[PDB]
């Protein structure tokens with residue numbers, strides 16, 4: 147396919163403040179959302195049907211992430227903690243304490259025995275899921291950490307920060323293996339590995355996404371056309387159909403680029419505030435998007451390709 151044709155299927159209302167993050171469960175059945183309203187909500191991935199609310203954080207939530215078996219969630223909160231949740235029972239299994247300021251980002255490793263987190267306190271922490279203990283504190287950056295992500299076999303962590311750096315860490319040793327420096331260093335507002343783990347996708351607050359070969363330490367692709375100067379917006383690799391890059395934008399649109407040609411192939415209209423988060427379904431051509439305070443809704447979009 148040369149262009150996808152995503153169309154709005156469902157609009158999911160329920161959060162009473164800005165939505166911060168949406169994530170599809172690895173088994174494809176569910177969507178989790180986090181919000182400034184201190185809640186996690188679970189929704190059906192295919193019908194958008196509200197399932198349940200998970201509560202417990204004392205302040206807003208900035209991020210949520212699924213374990214690989216789709217049975218657990220981890221959330222990152224302004225209350226300086228992460229919480230590990232059993233989704234079926236709703237129970238908080240562990241409260242991960244150690245960060246000294248807002249926790250902004252989180253992720254399980256593929257094995258899901260570890261959680262990585264990034265904080266306003268400028269550190270990256272690695273946690274043991276089963277014990278709830280912090281295993282390593284990495285002196286990762288000199289400004290708030292905007293994103294953290296494990297690669298495909300969990301051996302590496304990538305982190306990004308308003309200090310303008312992306313760094314690659316050895317999970318086991320905690321050593322910094324790579325620092326990515328462009329010809330300039332605008333604040334990096336998001337980063338994640340490509341599915342094959344050979345690239346990293348990095349968002350910067352100069353309306354630019356970049357695809358890096360992080361080993362070579364060189365930029366391969368650049369994506370522009372959207373607006374991103376203020377917020378940390380999630381971006382994605384869409385791989386179920388055509389190979390796209392997907393991102394939210396501060397002009398209330400979802401942007402989709404051809405990964406190879408860097409050309410915009412679709413802009414999804416519907417939201418009425420900044421689209422802060424997008425997620426791509428693991429097996430179907432489905433995108434979830436979520437918006438900030440003036441909108442508060444989550445949208446599910448489906449394409450034939």
Ligand SMILES: CN1CCc2cc(-c3cn4c(n3)CCC4)ccc21
Pocket residue numbers: 164165166167182207208209250251252292293294335336377378379380422438
């Ligand atoms: C309520 N607000 C305002 C904008 C915003 C942004 C985020 C966020 C978290 N993460 C990202 N954006 C990218 C990687 C992790 C969370 C909460 C909020």
Ligand SMILES: CN1CCc2cc(-c3cn4c(n3)CCC4)ccc21
Pocket residue numbers: 224248250265266290291292293308378
């Ligand atoms: C990744 N970075 C860059 C700037 C930033 C800002 C905040 C933040 C959240 N909240 C505040 N600041 C005040 C009330 C709630 C969290 C993470 C980050």
